[PDB]
């Protein structure tokens, strides 16, 4: 709010501010556009399902254990253990000091409303395969789906049917280490924390920059008005109004660039959800290192987490060829 | 470059479904793409098996999937219903009968045997 | 108000951020120290003899009520120039001490009594600080400080080693060393007496006639004030939005009892952004905490003015209980209060929504309110409803380990996609 | 460097510069971020082995 930030509910300052034109009708529109764009960003990554599917109560998928990624009904919020670990690691006096007209609006989509989307995607992808990306969900047993995925990377399907138990054990052991890797390394979620760290220091600087004089008697309008007559009061406060306007403009100028930086990553995440999750990708090093097999989504505060399952060759032996 | 001058395998890049074609049009300050795609239709569910064991040997499909209408086993392509008699050229044999979980008994037609035993007699 | 903000006579469906509501103050209070005795402003201005420049005297004024409009009748001056404060409101401020200096100079050097000035009299006799905050008064005194024979009682220093620092006085009378000759003797060539005398006589015209100068020095800092202007204190009110005036520092807000451990030499309390947060009452040794008024953004949810003429009002970030407190007659900055708390008051995590009723339904989002709440103009005969957005239709999938579903037909679908490529080219 | 660009090693200009606020703490951070980003740019294209 300009009228209350620049002028501390004064009347002379308000009159001068209206005399300065429409610099704050433009400021009130850029931030609104940024907020609407932020609301639109999350609607492309997650809202890609016609309906809200549910996994069957009986869970035996041929030896694969997905209990680490499906929602937990015991907890008050139906979030998988991975999601809870992610939420308990990003943290969102000075907040109450923004008596200067700076406020934060709540996002339209609730965290439960995003957990529901993620659960629907997971149920669809582990019950039907990639078929639900094209039309309606088409059921298929999970081992046969995995055999098709093997056949899609140049390996015959009898390999899976002959090493099903070994592959299931390897997948379970590999998925059982994500929690340990996340809970051990402290710099795991660093890209998400920087986003919330950069949006607080800007507000802190904006608040702290109210104490500058900008070449005047003092930084308080009340003292200036109580010690100097109006003919010089309108000269003293005119040196504060311009300084505060210049201080306010830089904030929106930098937010207009951070918004584009965020939008690029949102578009990349939407593409990754479309290609890695709703299908099998042949692009090299797009959905992980190796030969892509599967991907699973999870939600984190202000971001998304992809779990990529890939096939990596092993012990090699050399022969003579012709 | 990708949708119009070729066929795209990327999912949901040139429309919803399986991409077939695309046509360009011009609008003031922009372009319009008309994407022609293939969408599956009426579905019906059958009983399936991963392999078939005839002579104590496992037979896997070459291109397709095993399917059953209640009393007979066929091999069909994945994206369309077109059942066919299981022969020795629709399938390939690899391994013995007791490694795969879910194998079933059936018979595989041998086109050569009757044609070359009736005449050779 | 929405039409006025949009500068148009029509509005489309949506939510618009119109303005900010604030609670108006009730009354005004004044708190000044209880001082009665008047200040001695007659001795400074009405004196039979004034000290010389090199021995200017300083008089301390404190613990008295100072009225600055009476000294106009005490001397026939004309300018009364002040640097750090406008002379108009000198009666509306409280100072901690006042210092009065007085001397007699020549009319030529009156312009040298100013910050940043140098000369014969602003270098070796009397130098003002570069950050002076006070007043300077000078008036002609030729009829009572200049004789026909000549006046020699006024002295000034002209020779000295180095420039003297601000507000420092030198009264030494020793022979200056103005040559290679050792100036041990009483007088001689290259040895000068630093003090010279004026020659005030009626023959000299303007610019050489004697002038009488009095300098008043204040200091406006945060400290227990003793000298104050003639203003009357009022009673102390608490827990209500009022206009307070503590020792000359005005403001606006509610006052509450505070539990901050001040110190005897500490009177005010500040915070980041350098605004006052705690005050010490002048009459009684008590600590009060200042909190600003109640404020909040207001938004108007409307369907298209073509469709209908009803609106709903969202007060952002306020609990629904303070809105009736906010909605009072002649106490809210928005003039309109027709909505007030007239039913259909619903508490959203975004704010308080008035004019829209809540229903146990779930539709698509038409006008997004926030935190999963949307609003729309619909039937239950047509009104505005507020509901919870629905993500889609529930649909359980079937999974079996020996069943597969295969399609038996197909469809050809043609869709369209629009992409901007360029904008207009402009020149300025 | 603000203090040497705006003010040619003067002292009064420095005093007014400190009086004018913290507009050069913000300038010194954007350029540093740009430099670190430039260093990170070449580490993704080439360092893939
Ligand atoms: C799937 O994995 C989960 C997680 O490892 C298994 O749950 C664990 O089961 C063991 C043995 O009963 C317990 O000691 C652990 O405390 C369980 N962990 C949790 C987090 O509950 C689960 O048993 C696995 N599924 C199957 C069929 O074995
Ligand atoms: C499953 O498909 C087989 C295909 O051979 C069906 O068997 C044929 O059914 C037709 C119609 O009744 C008969 O005229 C043929 O003689 C049958 N063929 C043989 C070799 O017996 C079978 O009926 C189908 N099953 C169901 C339940 O419809
Ligand atoms: C048909 O399938 C059955 C089992 O599904 C096979 O039966 C096994 O045959 C072996 C060898 O004759 C015996 O050692 C097992 O005890 C049998 N098990 C059962 C459950 O019957 C049978 O071999 C398959 N082929 C034929 C022609 O029947
Ligand atoms: C809106 O104000 C009411 C009145 O104070 C709140 O109700 C009380 O809230 C406090 C904490 O805010 C609780 O300790 C009391 O138990 C509540 N009393 C009752 C009777 O519920 C109400 O919580 C406020 N609304 C919100 C969203 O905080
Ligand atoms: C098909 O149906 C279910 C999967 O939905 C599975 O049946 C379970 O199989 C496990 C291990 O094979 C047993 O421990 C459970 O007792 C079975 N439950 C039921 C209700 O049968 C299995 O994948 C398939 N069932 C059979 C009988 O093969
Ligand atoms: C596949 O779908 C098409 C329609 O998309 C079906 O063709 C229709 O068939 C009905 C009944 O014979 C006719 O009344 C319509 O005029 C046909 N439509 C068109 C466009 O020709 C077709 O029969 C379906 N195929 C199968 C095997 O069910
Ligand atoms: C395989 O490689 C090793 C060294 O890499 C070499 O000594 C060996 O001869 C190779 N095998 C054949 C069959 O050439
Ligand atoms: C096909 O699915 C329906 C319900 O979706 C089920 O009743 C039916 O038994 C299934 N067909 C077979 C052959 O299992
Ligand atoms: C100055 O003081 C004298 C003696 O006390 C008095 O007669 C005279 O009226 C005073 N003048 C003013 C202007 O106060
Ligand atoms: C006296 O005061 C002056 C004022 O600047 C200073 O320069 C000087 O050093 C002091 N001492 C002497 C002995 O002059
Ligand atoms: C006058 O001021 C003193 C200052 O300490 C205070 O103690 C006293 O109560 C005041 N008198 C009245 C009548 O308020
Ligand atoms: C109002 O809406 C009707 C129908 O939607 C349309 O015919 C009419 O032109 C509209 N009028 C205005 C002023 O928008
Ligand atoms: C709507 O929901 C509230 C809260 O559960 C309940 O008290 C009320 O009876 C419901 N009304 C209808 C019509 O469902």
Residue numbers in the entry:
A (entry chain A): 737 to 828, 849 to 1078
B (entry chain C): 1030 to 1150
C (entry chain C): 298 to 677, 689 to 736
D (entry chain B): 737 to 785
Mind quoting what the paper says about this structure?
We expressed and purified the prefusion-stabilized trimeric ectodomains of BA.1, BA.2, BA.3, BA.2.12.1, BA.2.13 and BA.4/BA.5 spike (S-trimer).
Compared with the RBD of BA.1, BA.2 contains three additional mutations, T376A, D405N and R408S, and lacks the BA.1 mutations G446S and G496S. Of note, S-trimers from the BA.2 sublineage harbour relatively less compact architectures in the region formed by the three copies of S2. The results reveal that the lack of G496S in BA.2 sublineages meant that the hydrogen bond with hACE2 K353 was regained, increasing their binding capability, in line with experimental observations revealed by deep mutational scanning (DMS) assay. Despite this discrepancy, we conclude that BA.2 subvariants and BA.4/BA.5 are able to maintain high binding affinities for hACE2.
